[PDB]
Enzyme design. Sequence first.
Site, PDB file in Angstrom:
ATOM      1  N   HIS A   1       0.812  -1.212   0.000  1.00 36.89           N
ATOM      2  CA  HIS A   1       0.000   0.000   0.000  1.00 36.89           C
ATOM      3  C   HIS A   1       0.847   1.264   0.000  1.00 36.89           C
ATOM      4  O   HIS A   1       0.331   2.339  -0.321  1.00 36.89           O
ATOM      5  CB  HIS A   1      -0.946  -0.005   1.205  1.00 36.89           C
ATOM      6  CG  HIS A   1      -2.025  -1.042   1.122  1.00 36.89           C
ATOM      7  ND1 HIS A   1      -2.912  -1.276   2.150  1.00 36.89           N
ATOM      8  CD2 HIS A   1      -2.361  -1.904   0.131  1.00 36.89           C
ATOM      9  CE1 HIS A   1      -3.747  -2.239   1.798  1.00 36.89           C
ATOM     10  NE2 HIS A   1      -3.435  -2.637   0.578  1.00 36.89           N
TER      11      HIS A   1
ATOM     12  N   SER B   1      -0.943  -0.828  -6.463  1.00 32.59           N
ATOM     13  CA  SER B   1      -0.759  -1.973  -7.340  1.00 32.59           C
ATOM     14  C   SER B   1      -0.140  -1.570  -8.675  1.00 32.59           C
ATOM     15  O   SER B   1      -0.329  -0.453  -9.166  1.00 32.59           O
ATOM     16  CB  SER B   1      -2.097  -2.670  -7.596  1.00 32.59           C
ATOM     17  OG  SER B   1      -2.611  -3.251  -6.411  1.00 32.59           O
TER      18      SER B   1
ATOM     19  N   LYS C   1     -15.358  -7.963  -7.554  1.00 34.23           N
ATOM     20  CA  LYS C   1     -14.527  -8.770  -8.441  1.00 34.23           C
ATOM     21  C   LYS C   1     -13.771  -9.844  -7.670  1.00 34.23           C
ATOM     22  O   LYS C   1     -13.563 -10.947  -8.189  1.00 34.23           O
ATOM     23  CB  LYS C   1     -13.557  -7.870  -9.204  1.00 34.23           C
ATOM     24  CG  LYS C   1     -12.742  -8.577 -10.270  1.00 34.23           C
ATOM     25  CD  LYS C   1     -12.170  -7.582 -11.269  1.00 34.23           C
ATOM     26  CE  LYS C   1     -11.307  -8.268 -12.314  1.00 34.23           C
ATOM     27  NZ  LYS C   1     -11.015  -7.374 -13.469  1.00 34.23           N
ATOM     28  N   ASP C   2     -13.354  -9.547  -6.437  1.00 35.66           N
ATOM     29  CA  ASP C   2     -12.726 -10.567  -5.604  1.00 35.66           C
ATOM     30  C   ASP C   2     -13.752 -11.560  -5.072  1.00 35.66           C
ATOM     31  O   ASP C   2     -13.436 -12.745  -4.904  1.00 35.66           O
ATOM     32  CB  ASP C   2     -11.969  -9.913  -4.444  1.00 35.66           C
ATOM     33  CG  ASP C   2     -10.683  -9.233  -4.889  1.00 35.66           C
ATOM     34  OD1 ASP C   2     -10.276  -9.411  -6.059  1.00 35.66           O
ATOM     35  OD2 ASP C   2     -10.078  -8.516  -4.061  1.00 35.66           O
TER      36      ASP C   2
ATOM     37  N   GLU D   1       3.668 -34.436  -3.800  1.00 39.09           N
ATOM     38  CA  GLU D   1       2.500 -33.805  -4.392  1.00 39.09           C
ATOM     39  C   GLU D   1       2.913 -33.019  -5.633  1.00 39.09           C
ATOM     40  O   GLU D   1       4.086 -32.691  -5.832  1.00 39.09           O
ATOM     41  CB  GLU D   1       1.819 -32.877  -3.383  1.00 39.09           C
ATOM     42  CG  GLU D   1       1.114 -33.594  -2.235  1.00 39.09           C
ATOM     43  CD  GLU D   1      -0.141 -34.330  -2.670  1.00 39.09           C
ATOM     44  OE1 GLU D   1      -0.682 -34.008  -3.750  1.00 39.09           O
ATOM     45  OE2 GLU D   1      -0.590 -35.230  -1.927  1.00 39.09           O
TER      46      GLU D   1
HETATM   47  C1  HEM Z   1       0.623 -16.224   1.802  1.00 35.74           C
HETATM   48  C2  HEM Z   1       1.181 -15.767   0.674  1.00 35.74           C
HETATM   49  C3  HEM Z   1       0.734 -14.460  -0.029  1.00 35.74           C
HETATM   50  C4  HEM Z   1      -0.400 -13.746   0.104  1.00 35.74           C
HETATM   51  C5  HEM Z   1      -1.631 -14.042   0.996  1.00 35.74           C
HETATM   52  C6  HEM Z   1      -0.305 -12.595  -0.776  1.00 35.74           C
HETATM   53  C7  HEM Z   1      -1.267 -11.619  -0.950  1.00 35.74           C
HETATM   54  C8  HEM Z   1      -1.176 -10.535  -1.799  1.00 35.74           C
HETATM   55  C9  HEM Z   1      -2.212  -9.551  -2.057  1.00 35.74           C
HETATM   56  C10 HEM Z   1      -3.623  -9.528  -1.425  1.00 35.74           C
HETATM   57  C11 HEM Z   1      -1.734  -8.667  -2.940  1.00 35.74           C
HETATM   58  C12 HEM Z   1      -2.489  -7.446  -3.510  1.00 35.74           C
HETATM   59  C13 HEM Z   1      -3.522  -7.897  -4.538  1.00 35.74           C
HETATM   60  C14 HEM Z   1      -2.834  -8.562  -5.702  1.00 35.74           C
HETATM   61  O1  HEM Z   1      -1.793  -8.038  -6.174  1.00 35.74           O
HETATM   62  O2  HEM Z   1      -3.323  -9.626  -6.156  1.00 35.74           O
HETATM   63  C15 HEM Z   1      -0.375  -9.049  -3.271  1.00 35.74           C
HETATM   64  C16 HEM Z   1       0.469  -8.386  -4.136  1.00 35.74           C
HETATM   65  C17 HEM Z   1       1.739  -8.774  -4.503  1.00 35.74           C
HETATM   66  N1  HEM Z   1       2.388  -9.918  -4.097  1.00 35.74           N
HETATM   67 FE1  HEM Z   1       1.678 -11.256  -2.766  1.00 35.74          FE
HETATM   68  N2  HEM Z   1       0.917 -12.638  -1.418  1.00 35.74           N
HETATM   69  C18 HEM Z   1       1.577 -13.770  -0.985  1.00 35.74           C
HETATM   70  C19 HEM Z   1       2.831 -14.179  -1.389  1.00 35.74           C
HETATM   71  C20 HEM Z   1       3.595 -13.612  -2.390  1.00 35.74           C
HETATM   72  C21 HEM Z   1       4.680 -14.237  -3.126  1.00 35.74           C
HETATM   73  C22 HEM Z   1       5.132 -15.700  -2.911  1.00 35.74           C
HETATM   74  C23 HEM Z   1       5.142 -13.342  -4.020  1.00 35.74           C
HETATM   75  C24 HEM Z   1       6.303 -13.467  -5.035  1.00 35.74           C
HETATM   76  C25 HEM Z   1       7.397 -14.193  -4.781  1.00 35.74           C
HETATM   77  C26 HEM Z   1       4.391 -12.117  -3.848  1.00 35.74           C
HETATM   78  C27 HEM Z   1       4.569 -10.943  -4.547  1.00 35.74           C
HETATM   79  C28 HEM Z   1       3.631  -9.946  -4.693  1.00 35.74           C
HETATM   80  C29 HEM Z   1       3.767  -8.749  -5.495  1.00 35.74           C
HETATM   81  C30 HEM Z   1       5.014  -8.378  -6.327  1.00 35.74           C
HETATM   82  C31 HEM Z   1       2.635  -8.047  -5.376  1.00 35.74           C
HETATM   83  C32 HEM Z   1       2.288  -6.708  -6.055  1.00 35.74           C
HETATM   84  C33 HEM Z   1       1.574  -7.079  -7.350  1.00 35.74           C
HETATM   85  C34 HEM Z   1       1.122  -5.858  -8.100  1.00 35.74           C
HETATM   86  O3  HEM Z   1       1.001  -4.773  -7.478  1.00 35.74           O
HETATM   87  O4  HEM Z   1       0.882  -5.981  -9.328  1.00 35.74           O
HETATM   88  N3  HEM Z   1       3.442 -12.330  -2.872  1.00 35.74           N
HETATM   89  N4  HEM Z   1      -0.079 -10.204  -2.573  1.00 35.74           N
HETATM   90  C1  LIG Z   2       7.030 -35.120   4.095  1.00 37.09           C
HETATM   91  O1  LIG Z   2       7.074 -35.246   2.660  1.00 37.09           O
HETATM   92  C2  LIG Z   2       6.200 -34.495   1.960  1.00 37.09           C
HETATM   93  C3  LIG Z   2       6.149 -34.527   0.636  1.00 37.09           C
HETATM   94  C4  LIG Z   2       5.186 -33.706  -0.115  1.00 37.09           C
HETATM   95  O2  LIG Z   2       5.062 -33.685  -1.311  1.00 37.09           O
HETATM   96  O3  LIG Z   2       4.412 -32.926   0.703  1.00 37.09           O
HETATM   97  C5  LIG Z   2       3.403 -32.034   0.167  1.00 37.09           C
HETATM   98  C6  LIG Z   2       7.095 -35.384  -0.113  1.00 37.09           C
HETATM   99  C7  LIG Z   2       6.690 -36.646  -0.522  1.00 37.09           C
HETATM  100  C8  LIG Z   2       7.535 -37.486  -1.216  1.00 37.09           C
HETATM  101  C9  LIG Z   2       8.822 -37.071  -1.497  1.00 37.09           C
HETATM  102  C10 LIG Z   2       9.252 -35.830  -1.073  1.00 37.09           C
HETATM  103  C11 LIG Z   2       8.390 -34.975  -0.408  1.00 37.09           C
HETATM  104  O4  LIG Z   2       8.780 -33.694   0.056  1.00 37.09           O
HETATM  105  C12 LIG Z   2       9.345 -32.773  -0.813  1.00 37.09           C
HETATM  106  C13 LIG Z   2       9.648 -31.537  -0.274  1.00 37.09           C
HETATM  107  C14 LIG Z   2      10.219 -30.607  -1.122  1.00 37.09           C
HETATM  108  O5  LIG Z   2      10.513 -29.381  -0.574  1.00 37.09           O
HETATM  109  C15 LIG Z   2      11.067 -28.375  -1.367  1.00 37.09           C
HETATM  110  C16 LIG Z   2      10.218 -27.714  -2.234  1.00 37.09           C
HETATM  111  C17 LIG Z   2      10.698 -26.706  -3.044  1.00 37.09           C
HETATM  112  C18 LIG Z   2      12.034 -26.343  -2.982  1.00 37.09           C
HETATM  113  C19 LIG Z   2      12.879 -26.997  -2.110  1.00 37.09           C
HETATM  114  C20 LIG Z   2      12.404 -28.020  -1.291  1.00 37.09           C
HETATM  115  C21 LIG Z   2      13.309 -28.674  -0.403  1.00 37.09           C
HETATM  116  N1  LIG Z   2      14.031 -29.198   0.306  1.00 37.09           N
HETATM  117  N2  LIG Z   2      10.474 -30.859  -2.384  1.00 37.09           N
HETATM  118  C22 LIG Z   2      10.161 -32.071  -2.831  1.00 37.09           C
HETATM  119  N3  LIG Z   2       9.604 -33.023  -2.094  1.00 37.09           N
END
Ligand code: HEM
Ligand SMILES: CO/C=C(/C(=O)OC)c1ccccc1Oc1cc(Oc2ccccc2C#N)ncn1
Lengths: 52, 52, 105, 378, 48, 89, 61
Positions: D200, D204, D226-227, D270
């Site tokens: 914020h 965005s 929309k959400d 998975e």
């Molecule tokens: C529990 C995990 C996460 C939640 C609940 C979450 C939630 C949100 C929300 C609500 C927004 C604003 C609305 C939207 O842009 O859709 C946002 C924006 C953003 N998120 Fe996440 N996020 C998470 C994880 C991540 C991850 C893993 C990344 C990238 C590695 C990330 C990067 C960003 C970026 C760059 C924005 C800004 C996007 C824009 O303004 O266009 N977030 N996130």
């Molecule tokens: C406890 O094992 C859980 C598993 C799973 O898929 O959970 C959702 C699993 C099952 C069989 C074999 C391996 C398993 O766990 C995992 C865990 C795993 O963790 C990572 C994911 C992304 C990047 C790095 C790692 C690591 N370390 N990357 C691959 N397999």
Amino acid sequence: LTRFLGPRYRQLARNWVPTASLWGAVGAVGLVWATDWRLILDWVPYINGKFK
Amino acid sequence: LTRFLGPRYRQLARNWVPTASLWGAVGAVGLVWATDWRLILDWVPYINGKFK
Amino acid sequence: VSASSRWLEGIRKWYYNAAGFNKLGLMRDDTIHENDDVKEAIRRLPENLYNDRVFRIKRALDLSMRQQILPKEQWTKYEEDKSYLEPYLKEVIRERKEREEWAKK
Amino acid sequence: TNIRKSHPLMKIVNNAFIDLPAPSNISSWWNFGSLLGICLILQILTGLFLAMHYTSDTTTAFSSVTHICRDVNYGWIIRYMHANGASMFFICLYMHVGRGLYYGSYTFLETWNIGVILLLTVMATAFMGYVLPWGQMSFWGATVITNLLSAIPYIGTNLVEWIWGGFSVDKATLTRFFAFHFILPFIIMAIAMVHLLFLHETGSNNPTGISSDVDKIPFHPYYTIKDILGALLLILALMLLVLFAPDLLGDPDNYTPANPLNTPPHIKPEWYFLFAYAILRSIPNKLGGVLALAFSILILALIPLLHTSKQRSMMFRPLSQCLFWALVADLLTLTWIGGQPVEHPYITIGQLASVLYFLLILVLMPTAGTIENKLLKW
Amino acid sequence: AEPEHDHRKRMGLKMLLMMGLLLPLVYAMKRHKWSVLKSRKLAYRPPK
Amino acid sequence: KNLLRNALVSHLDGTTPVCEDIGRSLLTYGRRIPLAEWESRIAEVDARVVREVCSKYFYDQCPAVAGFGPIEQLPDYNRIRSGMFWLRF
Amino acid sequence: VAPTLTARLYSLLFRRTSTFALTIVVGALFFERAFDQGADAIYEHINEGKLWKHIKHKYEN
Ligand code: HEM
Ligand SMILES: CO/C=C(/C(=O)OC)c1ccccc1Oc1cc(Oc2ccccc2C#N)ncn1
Ligand SMILES: CCCCCCCCCCCCCCCCCC(=O)OC[C@H](COP(=O)(O)OCCN)OC(=O)CCCCCCCCCCCCC
Ligand SMILES: CCCCCCCCCCCCCC(=O)OC[C@H](COP(=O)([O-])OCC[N+](C)(C)C)OC(=O)CCCCCCCCCCCCC
Ligand code: HEM
Ligand SMILES: CCCCCC(=O)OC[C@H](COP(=O)([O-])OCCN)OC(=O)CCCCC
Ligand SMILES: CCCCCC(=O)OC[C@H](COP(=O)([O-])OCCN)OC(=O)CCCCC
Ligand SMILES: CCCCCC(=O)OC[C@H](COP(=O)([O-])OCCN)OC(=O)CCCCC
């Protein structure tokens, strides 16, 4: 505490009584529907699908 | 990236080398003390209380 | 000047029409990413070019909402793309380079 | 004047969900922010209601889960919501991250790097959740992954035996994973609030990568509805898996109790971990596999440093669009290879796809942005 | 192995029917609010 | 009602206001409505009349909005349209 | 022709928000029975002779 005792404050109560009575029906009917309260629902015609 | 290449930026590195070297000793001695690292501690005179 | 430089210009006009910001009516300098140098250059634009930039960005954002584009007649022609921001941005960069060269001494 | 704006509590909700100026042109790829928030809440509610009946002991961990799906009233619907909700969580996470790469949102450094931390902690959460039912894959998935930590030089075994609480995945490992699987989703939710705090500060991004301050709209009613619509599609996708195919994404081995002696034939994670499982097995060296396995996700923190384009979004960059979908298809290849045995020709394909992954992110995609700058003459 | 088999399919049918109703109605609510924006017209009138 | 009575009598003070009231009324009303009749219609108004009459024209109605100047903070039309009803009522 | 049904639905039920809610909570009560009754009738018809309530009469006593 006694600021709200006068002609205007009684007029305001008059204007919101029809509304406050309807929100009570919304809350009452919402409570009976949410809990499946059979004491009240057994008297409604179409929701008698209980088969005691 | 190449903003920091000149006489002044080399003078700044000179002035902070004694400090950065001391924080490394604080971190190093702090890591050996926190973990009871016997590789380094066995050479210190008074902390030889191991009795292998 | 020669047939080969028209082929480099030929692929540049191809990439230009492939980039597709001309389909929204934008110009190349409308699409630039705003860093500190770019923000200063935009700040230095005269009133008319600033107001023109604002409406083109506004019109393109309105199209992007509807997932629409302009008719082909209203697209930005590659030959007519005015680099209105480059002379301002070149000067902002030149000043920063001077500040960065004094900081080295 | 206005109660919604001046009250200390409502002004935070007002300045986040109601009066927030949002761009007029953000597309469906911006819905995954809220959907991740819903998945996190959805996983906590079902997760809590499963903890009222699950026991974290080997003698009853498997059967307590059975006790839920059979005897507990609507326990089966609560479990499969939890198991499939985790998969929906990872669908949304990968759309959420891919949206950030394509459209340049990573230029928000603080928002993006906190996102990387959110990805890691959600992965660690699901990894520990899969151990709790204590099936075959629960045990052997935990064994093959935690054993990787022994490859760290000079502190490998001491670190692995500390995480285990013994000499292998055992009773002590199962109980603490339940405790850690409980604490982390709340730590995640707090970091998701800091994730919004830094967002914020700037607002965005939008599909064009151009500033939208000249054209903003309030978040309510336009993006509240929309959400809500997007959340309704999320429930459709979840309930289709829960009510018509609850065992599609899961492995049948997990319906057999744990067995430290008998190993299943094919140990596959998975679907949301197959791409990283493939990268692990494609590297012959053990310590090299761990570093590549950790670098497969930590590389995201380097994308802002590897941005060469004068333009922010890939919308106006065809040569980068092709490389972007080469990254998706290459990740769809690693996913496919991850669920297959380590035999010819899958060994060679998994190695090629692994190199192509890091080559696309480190070398090719940065080079395309520079070529694109020259074609536009800047 | 799946005593809940029949009941989830009965639930699945109700979920499909409710979704077939709720999805287009909620879609219509989205379009209703957004129509203000989707049909808005812009004009630029700078001084000359 | 008292503000209106004062406004009506203060306005019809001078030959030119009254001449305007005569000319305009004959085109609109087809007659001159005497001041005593305006007092009769004003005295008929009470709180019930205002609640009914205002709701007939204001409550849950689409307004026509016109803006000019620095109007970045002018509310969106949907938000304006939502201000034409109360959820508490 | 009198005003359409949607016009009389608005002025009579939807104008006030309180009656707008009373319409919904009352519409939710009858919708649940009518939808559960009808929906179950579709599930049992598609699965005729297979559910326990169909083969129940054979094992009365
Ligand atoms: C529990 C995990 C996460 C939640 C609940 C979450 C939630 C949100 C929300 C609500 C927004 C604003 C609305 C939207 O842009 O859709 C946002 C924006 C953003 N998120 Fe996440 N996020 C998470 C994880 C991540 C991850 C893993 C990344 C990238 C590695 C990330 C990067 C960003 C970026 C760059 C924005 C800004 C996007 C824009 O303004 O266009 N977030 N996130
Ligand atoms: C406890 O094992 C859980 C598993 C799973 O898929 O959970 C959702 C699993 C099952 C069989 C074999 C391996 C398993 O766990 C995992 C865990 C795993 O963790 C990572 C994911 C992304 C990047 C790095 C790692 C690591 N370390 N990357 C691959 N397999
Ligand atoms: C690391 C985890 C690995 C796990 C592997 C999972 C398997 C992957 C399965 C593949 C599913 C693909 C999803 C559907 C793609 C639809 C793309 C599209 O519709 O067309 C291109 C679109 C163009 O839209 P513009 O914004 O450029 O211009 C619009 C003007 N009308 O451009 C866009 O809309 C693109 C926006 C970004 C979408 C992100 C999808 C990719 C998900 C994985 C990314 C992981 C990165 C590390
Ligand atoms: C303990 C027992 C208690 C039980 C109580 C039961 C009560 C049941 C509900 C009744 C309350 C209705 C209130 C109402 O009706 O006022 C809400 C608002 C009005 O509607 P309006 O704008 O037409 O104005 C209306 C203008 N008039 C009035 C002039 C026509 O309704 C809307 O706007 C919002 C509707 C959209 C629904 C989706 C929201 C749920 C969240 C997401 C779900 C999916 C993922 C989780
Ligand atoms: C980000 C949030 C969460 C994610 C991604 C997640 C993921 C998972 C997954 C994939 C499983 C395996 C389920 C199975 O295979 O049957 C699981 C198990 C479990 N989780 Fe979670 N979970 C989350 C939050 C929680 C919370 C907050 C709790 C406790 C309050 C919880 C309690 C449990 C329990 C008791 C189990 C074992 C029961 C079972 O296997 O179904 N979860 N989790
Ligand atoms: C606040 C928590 C209330 C919990 C009530 C509960 O769980 O449901 C019990 C009854 C069931 O309906 P009945 O006709 O069997 O009735 C059987 C009577 N025991 O429903 C009611 O009667 C609702 C009563 C509401 C009072 C606050
Ligand atoms: C970041 C987590 C580190 C965990 C290390 C641990 O738990 O302690 C192991 C050793 C114990 O000292 P030692 O002399 O027995 O040595 C025995 C060697 N195995 O302490 C060390 O040697 C510290 C090493 C620090 C490296 C980062
Ligand atoms: C238990 C019932 C709670 C009712 C709250 C409510 O509906 O919020 C108000 C808005 C519509 O009213 P408005 O924004 O036009 O304001 C009218 C001002 N006169 O509705 C929505 O669109 C908001 C979405 C809520 C998601 C939880």
